[PDB]
Design an enzyme around this catalytic site. Structure first.
Site, PDB file in Angstrom:
ATOM      1  N   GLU A   3       2.376  -0.355   0.803  1.00  0.00           N
ATOM      2  CA  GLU A   3       3.264   0.243   1.795  1.00  0.00           C
ATOM      3  C   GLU A   3       2.525   1.280   2.631  1.00  0.00           C
ATOM      4  O   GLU A   3       2.655   1.316   3.860  1.00  0.00           O
ATOM      5  CB  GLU A   3       4.467   0.883   1.108  1.00  0.00           C
ATOM      6  CG  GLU A   3       5.376  -0.081   0.394  1.00  0.00           C
ATOM      7  CD  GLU A   3       5.071  -0.203  -1.086  1.00  0.00           C
ATOM      8  OE1 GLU A   3       3.881  -0.175  -1.468  1.00  0.00           O
ATOM      9  OE2 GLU A   3       6.031  -0.324  -1.873  1.00  0.00           O
TER      10      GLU A   3
ATOM     11  N   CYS B  22       8.425   0.966  -2.479  1.00  0.00           N
ATOM     12  CA  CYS B  22       8.222   2.396  -2.680  1.00  0.00           C
ATOM     13  C   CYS B  22       8.417   2.791  -4.143  1.00  0.00           C
ATOM     14  O   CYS B  22       8.855   3.899  -4.455  1.00  0.00           O
ATOM     15  CB  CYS B  22       9.133   3.188  -1.739  1.00  0.00           C
ATOM     16  SG  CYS B  22       8.415   3.216  -0.082  1.00  0.00           S
TER      17      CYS B  22
END
Ligand SMILES: [Cl-]
Length: 182
Positions: free
Chosen positions: A58, A87
């Site tokens: 990410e 996340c």
């Protein structure tokens, strides 16, 4: 764009909740410019990323955004097809939030092969992404096959689903939707 090894795709995007590999995240991305009722995508704005030496996929996507040369006067939809709970890693959601707040011309869509409902930090990361404006949902057969067709070195071979793909997707989706319900 460089195309992903097909066994790497199948091994990582497998959504079996009983398999919890603790190493890698793959993130297939595409950027679309939204204009005049259609979506405009460039091959150079497409590819995939994995975690590399402790830097999570990410954040590696955030790192490459300047190289994308996005026009701040335009509207873009960024889609992530991500093989692990988005996340999951410490501080990741906060860094995505900061990026979205500083780039209001970007709309982030996240299609996740699975989530990690720990009734704690990883669950809260999902709500943080939503609160920052990201649209988070679970990958279905449609998204898995699209990723196979689009990002994988498949040599014209059709997507072959694993056992339980739909059952697992619907179960994960029910939990993600409960977490993100408003
Ligand atoms: Cl969903």
């Amino acid at each position: 764009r460089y195309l992903m090894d097909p066994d790497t795709f199948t091994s990582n995007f497998n959504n079996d909740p009983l398999v919890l590999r603790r190493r890698q995240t793959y993130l297939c991305y595409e950027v679309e410019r939204l204009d005049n009722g259609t979506s405009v995508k460039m091959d150079q704005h497409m590819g995939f990323l994995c975690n590399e030496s402790g830097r999570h996929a990410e954040l590696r996507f955030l790192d490459l955004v300047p190289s994308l040369q996005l026009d701040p006067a335009q509207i873009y939809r960024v889609t992530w097809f991500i093989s692990w709970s988005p996340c999951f890693s410490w501080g990741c959601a906060g860094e995505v939030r900061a990026f979205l707040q500083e780039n209001t011309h970007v709309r982030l869509r996240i299609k996740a092969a699975r989530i990690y409902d720990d009734q704690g930090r990883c669950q809260e990361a999902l709500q943080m992404l939503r609160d920052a404006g990201a649209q988070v949902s679970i990958m279905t057969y449609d998204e898995f096959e699209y990723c196979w067709d689009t990002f994988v070195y498949r040599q014209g071979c059709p997507f072959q689903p694993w056992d339980g793909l739909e059952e697992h997707s619907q179960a994960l989706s029910g939990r993600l939707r409960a977490i993100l319900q408003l």
